């Protein structure tokens, strides 16, 4: 029962350590109650003895339903796909690298925060291209996701999107500088035209053979791939570190960027850069378990991957 002062004192640090203010006293009271509940889920679950751990991250504050409301940032879907530029000339056989990490080769930008906007699709693409660019130009630069939300009207801004559409958009129109067309957390009129600075260009997009690990790994190996996953899970909400191995279903709702893969003695994984800031997961990133060869992947990870192709 002393525990109570302990908890209060504790909720308190978590608060300023994540720059959290509440206007009225009762909200804090409410928040505190949520927090407490979350914490319990976090213990019952860490005691489970799995390969990762949950924690008091950026979202400890919120309830699960509340979390999906403002941050899941959905995907939309098309059928009998447009049969893309270069159908990934099908891979499989391993005995290719052991560990890849496109951050070592200065090909990944700092991590970002998508706010209360369902723009993960835009963010995902921007990343994969920022990468394929440095792999060619030997120069890494900060591109604007904002353009994609405002132009590229096939996908619906904050209401969700489709990454391939975002990609085909570059092949056809290039893309501007983040510094020039900043991100604003809501869709505006496509100002692509009245904004200066160089524009990165590309030629096409490539679709990788789904539901197979080999195909993906080899793809990742050449450059960073945009891929999908089911992020609505409660575990996922409160992830802190490790090799996440569920629980999570295959009903995908978000776009992320796989920037590597590796193995930590026994367990193999794919390394992803997410759009939730640095206070979530491992400094913005998450490492997900690898399902071997044939399946949709853990949390439907293998389900849908694409990459820009540059001249």
Curated annotation (Swiss-Prot):
User: Mind listing the UniProt keywords for this protein, alphabetically?
Assistant: Disulfide bond, Glycoprotein, Hydrolase, Protease, Signal, Thiol protease, Zymogen
Tell me, which GO biological process terms does this entry list?
proteolysis
Q: Which reaction does it catalyse?
A: Hydrolysis of proteins with broad specificity for peptide bonds, similar to those of papain and chymopapain
User: What does the record give as EC number?
Assistant: 3.4.22.30
Species in which this protein is naturally found:
Carica papaya (Papaya)
Tagged with keyword Protease: yes
Assembly, in brief, is: Monomer.
Q: What does the entry list as the binding residues for E64?
A: 120
**What are the disulfide bonds?**
117-158, 151-190, 248-299
Q: Name one GO molecular function term.
A: cysteine-type peptidase activity
Report the enzyme's class at the first EC level.
hydrolase
Reported function: Cysteine proteinase with a high level of diversity in substrate specificity.
The protein depicted here goes by the name Caricain
């Amino acid at each position: 029962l002393t525990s109570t002062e302990r908890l209060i004192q504790l909720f308190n640090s978590w608060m300023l350590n994540h720059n959290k203010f509440y206007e009225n006293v009762d909200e804090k009271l409410y928040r505190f109650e949520i927090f407490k509940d979350n914490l319990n889920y976090i213990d019952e679950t860490n005691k489970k003895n799995n390969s990762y751990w949950l924690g008091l991250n950026e979202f400890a504050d919120l309830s699960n339903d509340e979390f999906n409301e403002k941050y899941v940032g959905s995907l939309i879907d098309a059928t009998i796909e447009q049969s893309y530029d270069e159908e990934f000339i099908n891979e499989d056989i391993v005995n290719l690298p052991e560990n890849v990490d496109w951050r070592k080769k200065g090909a990944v930008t700092p991590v970002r925060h998508q706010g209360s906007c369902g723009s993960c699709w835009a963010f995902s693409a921007v990343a994969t291209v920022e990468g394929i660019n440095k792999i060619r130009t030997g120069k890494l630069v900060e591109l604007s996701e904002q353009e994609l939300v405002d132009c590229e009207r096939r996908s619906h801004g904050c209401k969700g999107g489709y990454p391939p559409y975002a990609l085909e958009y570059v092949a056809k129109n290039g893309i501007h500088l983040r510094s020039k067309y900043p991100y604003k957390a809501k869709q505006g009129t496509c100002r692509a035209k009245q904004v200066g600075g160089p524009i990165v260009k590309t030629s096409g997009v490539g679709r990788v053979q789904p539901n197979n690990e080999g195909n993906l790994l080899n793809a990742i190996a050449k450059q960073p791939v945009s891929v999908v996953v089911e992020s609505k899970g409660r575990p996922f909400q409160l992830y802190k570190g490790g090799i996440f191995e569920g629980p999570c279903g295959t009903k995908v709702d978000g776009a992320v960027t796989a920037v590597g893969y590796g193995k930590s003695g026994g367990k193999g994984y794919i390394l992803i850069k997410n759009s939730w800031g640095t206070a979530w997961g491992e400094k913005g990133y998450i490492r997900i378990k690898r399902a071997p060869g044939n399946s949709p992947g853990v949390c439907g990870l293998y389900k849908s991957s694409y990459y820009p192709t540059k001249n």
